[PDB]
């Protein structure tokens with residue numbers, strides 16, 4: 248008995264869910280189940296054992312792809328959203344969320360600035376959620392307030408000129424769309440880690456870097472008010488410059504140090520972070 | 532522990548450490564309040580980062596249960612954090628701490644509601660409920676010198692405080708004995724049959740909570756009443772439950788048709 | 802002869 | 816030469832009163 252069956256097919260996934268999802272004796276309403284942050288409707292149902300099936304392209308319905316060195320991981324979820332109570336003032340049942348994952352095996356140097364002759368001449372950026380010690384990748388589940396997200400940004404290192412990686416901005420939201428409500432800016436103003444400027448957070452970029460094409464940072468976990476699904480998506484804007492180019496107010500990684508009450512770059516001159524405090528790092 | 536309670540003669544005094552969660556991080560004094568009424572603190576001891584509340588045993592929305600040999604006053608401390616740098620997110624969770632005071636006690640009728648375990652054998656704790664659980668409530672009336680009686684519940688109303696006329700509120704029982712909660716949605720709410728005694732009335736209610744309420748608690752105020760133990764039930768004095776299976780109302784005792792006014796939503800005598 | 806009795810506070814834990 | 820990368824979904828605990836010990 249598998250409450251949730253996942254078929255990872257060639258260019259689609261097929262999820263089958265039992266309506267006795269909690270085995271509480273009460274079957275859930277088929278329409279209360281949806282797929283991914285987009286809430287796609289089910290594709291079919293089978294009254295024989297009371298199941299509901301969802302089928303979607305690997306890129307549809309708000310799925311999220313991570314590209315690792317030797318695999319592709321597509322991640323999405325099943326939503327259970329109970330229908331409102333006859334009287335709206337009360338709530339008898341909480342919304343649930345079920346993580347869904349699909350794994351697939353993957354298949355004259357150059358510069359990204361001057362040209363891209365080959366289809367193959369393409370940078371692959373990635374964000375990874377790492378363990379406290381940064382040794383290995385860690386699960387997307389089990390987080391509590393008071394825990395810390397260790398995020399590692401990196402860019403592929405093959406057959407190109409040495410690069411230095413930067414994070415222009417990160418934004419958390421309840422879906423992969425960062426322009427949706429609600430949302431909160433972790434990094435902003437071209438590399439200013441503004442989350443570590445306020446309250447009692449210890450959010451910061453880590454120094455030194457492992458390579459110039461890797462940027463690490465720690466973020467204190469949080470959640471969105473009014474959100475009963477208890478999830479977080481984070482969309483970052485990464486960019487690169489040549490590995491020996493001087494950092495400046497447009498290309499930097501600055502953290503606020505509460506202990507010294509100052510901004511501190513991962514590299515570069517101290518005064519490059521000045522525009523972080525003013526909240527505007529846009530060239531005149 | 533981080534909460535000391537002094538149960539004194541006609542007042543309680545609660546002392547709370549601001550390092551409430553044992554992490555070293557001190558909460559704001561103003562984020563603590565007493566009872567559903569949210570009474571402000573009475574004093575602060577800065578040297579020990581403590582906050583003290585003092586209130587009469589009947590103030591601040593406390594709730595008294597009268598048992599055969601004891602009086603139990605129940606209240607709580609609320610921690611309601613102040614808004615984050617950006618109010619769309621939350622960095623620190625709310626909290627609620629139950630507070631209890633026991634006093635030995637020292638023909639009129641005494642009514643009581645008790646929260647019972649699923650087997651009805653014993654009374655159970657007011658904590659540990661989750662959405663999906665069931666409240667087993669037992670209404671009863673003391674055994675006086677006087678004649679045998681029959682107990683009825685006119686109405687129950689849940690709210691965020693002992694005042695049932697406050698917002699929000701929800702009617703569990705209404706229209707003089709109609710258990711309207713069991714009429715809608717997929718609830719199994721009903722009166723239990725048969726009764727243990729004629730002066731006892733049991734019912735099960737599917738747990739719920741109020742939208743927008745971050746404290747996650749509920750109070751239930753019922754109106755109980757009695758009639759002679761052998762008086763015919765009527766549309767004014769009854770205990771009716773709804774059954775979805777048969778789409779009908781069913782009294783615990785009495786003629787089936789007594790529950791008719793339940794569906795119409797008016798059981799006035801007029 | 803009637804009366805109003807209050808039961809609570811009932812706390813939900815998650 | 817930039818790009819937008821998404822990380823998630825990150826799942827938190829259902830308990831909105833969760834606190835340290």
Ligand SMILES: *[C@H]1O[C@H](CO)[C@H](O)[C@H](O[C@@H]2O[C@H](CO)[C@H](O)[C@H](O)[C@H]2O)[C@H]1NC(C)=O
Nearest residue numbers: 355356357358359361405406407408409410
């Ligand atoms: C591509 O990347 C290479 C490895 O990082 C290296 O930077 C290379 O540059 C050419 O390499 C030659 C032999 O090492 C000489 O150094 C030559 O001067 C240099 O152009 C990069 N090539 C290009 C075309 O950018």
